[PDB]
Ligand SMILES: OC[C@H]1O[C@@](CO)(O[C@H]2O[C@H](CO)[C@@H](O)[C@H](O)[C@H]2O)[C@@H](O)[C@@H]1O
Ligand SMILES: OC[C@H]1O[C@@](CO)(O[C@H]2O[C@H](CO)[C@@H](O)[C@H](O)[C@H]2O)[C@@H](O)[C@@H]1O
């Protein structure tokens with residue numbers, strides 16, 4: 001997260017860290033046994049870390065749970081990042097408490113102008129490599145489809161939304177991918193891609209979760 005602020009400890013209780021030796025992507029806990037993330041974060045072995053604030057210190061509130069099943073969207077395109085969504089089934093259920101909680105799936109798609117909260121442990125400098133220990137937070141609005149497509153001509157599908165600021169300076173970044181965009185208590189986006197980070201006229205692009213509610217619910221039911 002570039003240009004954000006340090007979240008209050010354990011104030012984003014649905015945020016997880018995906019770890020395969022080191023932190024490499026975020027995700028969101030949507031029920032006690034399932035996490036949603038970005039398909040481009042796929043790896044064959046993933047450990048999910050819940051209840052984290054400082055990912056570099058064992059604090060006492062964390063749960064470390066290995067993934068049992070990793071399911072990417074059947075229409076994920078690794079070149080365009082269309083359908084950049086995947087589900088992780090945990091090997092055992094998470095213990096839900098004040099520091100570990102679920103986030104709701106969307107009841108409708110978010111309108112342009114809705115303010116949302118984006119969070120993660122990704123890069124905090126746009127070009128540098130400055131990866132934080134403490135979870136970062138950013139408030140940003142959903143942008144109109146026309147603004148998103150004007151920024152990324154020929155690259156935005158119906159499964160993508162832009163969230164952020166056309167003047168730059170505040171954005172998600174490498175390391176935040178797979179993490180949550182939550183608006184009015186509902187998960188509306190998954191951190192997916194963008195040109196650089198926090199550049200003028202290059203807002204972040206996010207997977208449009210409202211298009212996938214039935215797929216998520218069917219997949220959980222079947223697996
Ligand atoms: O990892 C390099 C390369 O991967 C991307 C996604 O394609 O970002 C990934 O890598 C970060 C690892 O630190 C991840 O944490 C982030 O979750 C994930 O998207 C690119 O943005 C980057 O060039
Ligand atoms: O890293 C994002 C960056 O890649 C570009 C192409 O130069 O977009 C392509 O790559 C993205 C990979 O993350 C795809 O998601 C996107 O669909 C495709 O355009 C830049 O436009 C983008 O900023």
Ligand SMILES: [Ca+2]
Nearest residue numbers: 054055057059
């Ligand atoms: Ca920790």
